[PDB]
Curated annotation (Swiss-Prot), chain A:
UniProt gene name: FCF1
Residues of the full protein shown: 41 to 188 of 189
Protein name: rRNA-processing protein FCF1
Domain PINc as annotated: residue spans: 23-122
GO molecular-function terms, A-Z: RNA endonuclease activity
Record carries keyword Coiled coil: no
Subcellular location(s) per record: Nucleus, Nucleolus
Sorted UniProt keywords: Nucleus, Ribosome biogenesis, rRNA processing
Nucleotide-binding as UniProt keyword: no
Curated annotation (Swiss-Prot), chain B:
GO cellular component: 90S preribosome; box C/D methylation guide snoRNP complex; nucleolus; nucleoplasm; small-subunit processome
Natural source organism: Saccharomyces cerevisiae (strain ATCC 204508 / S288c)
Complete-protein stretch covered: 79 to 323 of 327
UniProt-recorded name of the protein: rRNA 2'-O-methyltransferase fibrillarin
Gene Ontology biological process terms from the UniProt entry: box C/D sno(s)RNA 3'-end processing; maturation of SSU-rRNA; regulation of transcription by RNA polymerase I; rRNA 2'-O-methylation; rRNA methylation; rRNA processing; snoRNA guided rRNA 2'-O-methylation
Subcellular location: Nucleus, Nucleolus
UniProtKB/Swiss-Prot annotation, chain C:
Covalent link location (Glycyl lysine isopeptide (Lys-Gly) (interchain with G-Cter in ubiquitin)): 110
Species: Saccharomyces cerevisiae (strain ATCC 204508 / S288c) (Baker's yeast)
Residues of the full protein shown: 172 to 403 of 511
More details: Present with 34700 molecules/cell in log phase SD medium.
Name of the gene encoding the protein in the UniProt record: NOP58
Record's protein name: Nucleolar protein 58
One of the GO BP terms on file: maturation of SSU-rRNA
Function of the molecule: Required for pre-18S rRNA processing. May bind microtubules.
Subcellular location: Nucleus, Nucleolus
GO terms for MF: mRNA binding; snoRNA binding; snRNA binding
Keywords of this entry: Coiled coil, Isopeptide bond, Nucleus, Ribonucleoprotein, Ribosome biogenesis, rRNA processing, Ubl conjugation
Annotated family: Belongs to the NOP5/NOP56 family.
Keyword Ubl conjugation applies: yes
Residues of the Nop domain: 112-232
Subunit details: Interacts with SIK1/NOP56 and NOP1. Interacts with the trimethylguanosine synthase TGS1. Component of the ribosomal small subunit (SSU) processome composed of at least 40 protein subunits and snoRNA U3.
GO cellular component, one term: small-subunit processome
Swiss-Prot record, chain D:
UniProt entry keywords in alphabetical sequence: mRNA processing, mRNA splicing, Nucleus, Ribonucleoprotein, Ribosome biogenesis, RNA-binding, rRNA processing, Spliceosome
Cross-referenced Pfam families: Ribosomal_L7Ae
GO cellular component entries: box C/D methylation guide snoRNP complex; nucleolus; nucleoplasm; nucleus; precatalytic spliceosome; small-subunit processome; spliceosomal complex; U4 snRNP
Protein's name according to its UniProt entry: 13 kDa ribonucleoprotein-associated protein
Effect of residue 77 to L: Impairs binding to U4 snRNA, but not U3 snoRNA, and causes pre rRNA processing defects and an accumulation of unspliced U3 snoRNA
Family label: Belongs to the eukaryotic ribosomal protein eL8 family.
Lineage: Eukaryota, Fungi, Dikarya, Ascomycota, Saccharomycotina
Species whose genome carries this gene: Saccharomyces cerevisiae (strain ATCC 204508 / S288c) (Baker's yeast)
Residues in coiled coil: none
GO BP terms in the entry: box C/D sno(s)RNA 3'-end processing; maturation of SSU-rRNA; maturation of SSU-rRNA from tricistronic rRNA transcript (SSU-rRNA, 5.8S rRNA, LSU-rRNA); mRNA splicing, via spliceosome; snoRNA guided rRNA 2'-O-methylation; spliceosomal complex assembly
Amino acid sequence: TRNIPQVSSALFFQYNQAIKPPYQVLIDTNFINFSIQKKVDIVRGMMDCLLAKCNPLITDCVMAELEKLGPKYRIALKLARDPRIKRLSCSHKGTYADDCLVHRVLQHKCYIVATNDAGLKQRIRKIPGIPLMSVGGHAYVIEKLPDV
Amino acid sequence: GARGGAKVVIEPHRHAGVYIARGKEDLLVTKNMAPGESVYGEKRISVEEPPTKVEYRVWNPFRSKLAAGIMGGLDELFIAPGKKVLYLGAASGTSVSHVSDVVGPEGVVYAVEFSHRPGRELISMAKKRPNIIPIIEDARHPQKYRMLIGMVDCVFADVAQPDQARIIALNSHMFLKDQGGVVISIKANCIDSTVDAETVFAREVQKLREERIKPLEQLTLEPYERDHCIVVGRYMRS
Amino acid sequence: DLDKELNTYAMRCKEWYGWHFPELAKIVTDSVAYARIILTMGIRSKASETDLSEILPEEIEERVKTAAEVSMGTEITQTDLDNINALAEQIVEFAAYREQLSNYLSARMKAIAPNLTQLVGELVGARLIAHSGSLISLAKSPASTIQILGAEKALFRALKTKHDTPKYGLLYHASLVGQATGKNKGKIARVLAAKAAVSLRYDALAEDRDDSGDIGLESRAKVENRLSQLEG
Amino acid sequence: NPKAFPLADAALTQQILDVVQQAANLRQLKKGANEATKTLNRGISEFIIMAADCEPIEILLHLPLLCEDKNVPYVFVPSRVALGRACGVSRPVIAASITTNDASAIKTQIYAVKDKIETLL
Amino acid sequence: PIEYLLFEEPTGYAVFKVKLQQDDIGSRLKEVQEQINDFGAFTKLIELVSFAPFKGAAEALENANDISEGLVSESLKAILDLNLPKAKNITLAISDKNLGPSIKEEFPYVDCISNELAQDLIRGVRLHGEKLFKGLQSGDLERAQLGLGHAYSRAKVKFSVQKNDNHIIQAIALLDQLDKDINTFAMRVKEWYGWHFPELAKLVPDNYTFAKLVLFIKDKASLNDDSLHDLAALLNEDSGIAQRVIDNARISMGQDISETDMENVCVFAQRVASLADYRRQLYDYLCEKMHTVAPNLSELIGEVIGARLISHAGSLTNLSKQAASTVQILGAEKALFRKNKGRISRYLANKCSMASRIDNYSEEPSNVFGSVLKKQVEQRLEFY
RNA sequence: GCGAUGAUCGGCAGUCUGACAAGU
RNA sequence: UGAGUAGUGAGAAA
Ligand SMILES: [Zn+2]
């Protein structure tokens, strides 16, 4: 049987009419450094960037990467376990975080992706209606979220 | 459209136990376990076979949330002939009787319902169809009717309840076989009307993952119904 | 008529008693045995102690007992029980009289047309006489009409449409026709019909006929020899 | 537990009867049990109103049997004389029906009351 | 630490012994989970010690409710008593935590377990089903579930035979069958006895009466004054047939038929008497049943007419659901309700409709409303 | 001393044929 | 020998 995946009902051409405040945002592992490195707090750099209440989300795969890092990145590990950061369970064998994040956004058009990886960012860019959050300069920046 | 005296060509559908009636319009149909009657007034197709007159029932996507699902093209349906199925939220025989058609004589349908008044007709329908076992009981406490049900190959939940995830897990934990079938009908308005539909579906998928059900597929049910998706998963005990 | 009517009542009893125990119809198919069970046991609880040996063999009687406890039917009041028993009393009774009428009929044939009963039989002989309306009326008919007596619809349909005519008629159900096979059935029908006429004219028009059926006996013997050589 | 159930309170009954009078003026109201039955058969009824003081109550219990079969909200009011009054008819009314019309000039309050009736159920 | 397991099945109660205890820390490992699915491995874990089938359907329904409500039945108490040693404390695996307190109360010496380890074994026992009793007679579990289930379901629904109206529908579909059928056989009795002396077929047109007189008057020759009185008692002498038959029997052309022929007529006539006798019995039962189920409808129009209307609708629930106009045309083919006459029929149809509503949605219908409702029709009747 | 618990509008249709058949 | 067993729905009376 042939498969033609149905484009999500949350999408009108290129604008997602479903993503709305309070936003749910997936945290990428590299985001934590450029947050710590820039002295930008996770919860509120998001609020300042998006001017809304933001619910950060750490999946098992991104989490699984973090402890593998080791003592050098303990600060990143502890901030990941801040109780304000909710946890997402995963039911796929692989621990590669980039693939897991790309799948979740493919599945449901309700997440913001917080990452600075060029390769991952390009993959998310191809997927329509996925707001992409990044940290540059002094604070966070959101590109595909016109409600801003 | 499909008038009384019209002649149609019946052909099988990709899923076993589901047949397609062709014509100027196409009707997706199921063989009648109890020929000669309609359960909710549905149109019936009769075919002469060597000659016995086998009957078929039309299967309205605007009435059964399952039916709109197959119209949308679900990849995998655990509901198949000669399989045990556990139907939750069996308000009446509108959809159960058709699920009974697919499973056939060899399988059975465990129809679970709570509210007494719709249950009465479910009992009445169960009389014509030997293979349904209606269980007028609140699904939130599967301990009550553990007596009546063994293992089940697939569990279907059409329950419109905000805590519908919990009911599925408890029922699946008891009677669903390892690697069994899970097919859920979700209405976000009943669960959380404050947030948008897509947020709700992601949340429901999450709770299923917490309960050791691996989701396999989900599909939006438009244009037949609003804010509805059917999630298909497999119960992975280990 | 009795055959038709006992069937309809049997259907009603199966449906009505099926409400209190729907599983019986599948297990026991005989209508009379179906009624007797209701008479012996009235309610499924009574099944545990009752013995159905005289009505049913061992394997059948135990299956109904197991069905009784795991049944689907609902409980019924004694008022309901009484009248369904009355039906079951009627159902068994018709069978008793139906057998009686069968024996009464056969005795009637062996005195009024002994020769035909020997050749064609009692039941088929009766339908032949009834179709003509009288023994004399049938006696005056040629053997050709007797061969196709009960196939008028097929006969005249064939005659109008320039197609083959029937060859058995009502005589098809006679034992001798059944013994024949293939095209020999048609030949025996012609031979049997002719001999039936010879015997028939004896029964109807013999003033001092001996109630022995002897002319039927050699007439039967001749057809049997024809069947043997034709089949061989 | 009581056969008449759910029964609207003093506050809730007023808004329901308010919609009833507005519907009557706009010919969107079907009055009487027999009419309400017909609307349920046709599937053109937005929701059904009954009086809890019908004498006897049973003669309108067929609407609840119809209602949730067709997934139509319903509710009971304490008074039939009051219900007939708002209906604009000079006689008591034990049951009435609001006809479906998405082009009606009084759509908004109809859905407002319907939402509350659904919550009560 | 699990040594015994309790499993509840529709036939009875099953108690098991855990021969081997699976790894607890390694419970989530795949192989131990695969062991549950595999029958051969599962057999090495547990073994059946006792099975107590229920005596009958009543016990199963009673125990299912007790099992449903987390209670210990007498049957359940027995099988645990016979199997569990008194004993530090014997460990039992139970699917339900709610049962645990009840078991502990009855048996202080048993500690119940319902942890995941127990659930794994419960899952396996339910998994293999009939295979694990080693041929012990438990029927087939799927069919026992069907019979138990509907009783359990009907129980929580409080479904009552009193509300059953199918008996009425069968009575009507049967009563007319008898009426046509009694006519059919009775006519034939007239023909058979008609030859022996035809004139009685003319004298007593009523077929039901005719069979009795044939049963009494088998031979027309037998004519006595005392017999005249006896047949005079049959029916009444107002018609004078008692004198006519005596006179006309003396003087008739009917050819005597054989004793076997006469034996058939009386026996054949005796059949017509029996069905009509039963038909009267069944007709009475219909009237009794209609008063019970639909006193309002039966009182308002009648027991026979109301039953026919119910059968036409297909069920009393259906009739109450129908609108007044629909009810009127339901019986407009047989004129059940029947310009001024037409008005009454429509008016009567409406009253019958609400009368059905009272009966259908009433746990114990009364006839108080039907009486006044019929009285209301009477006042409407006299007005026109 | 009215009414939504309901005013008003017998036909088709005619009872097959008649000396050959089977074997070396 | 050949040869087919989906009525309408507020008036009515004066
Ligand atoms: Zn993951």
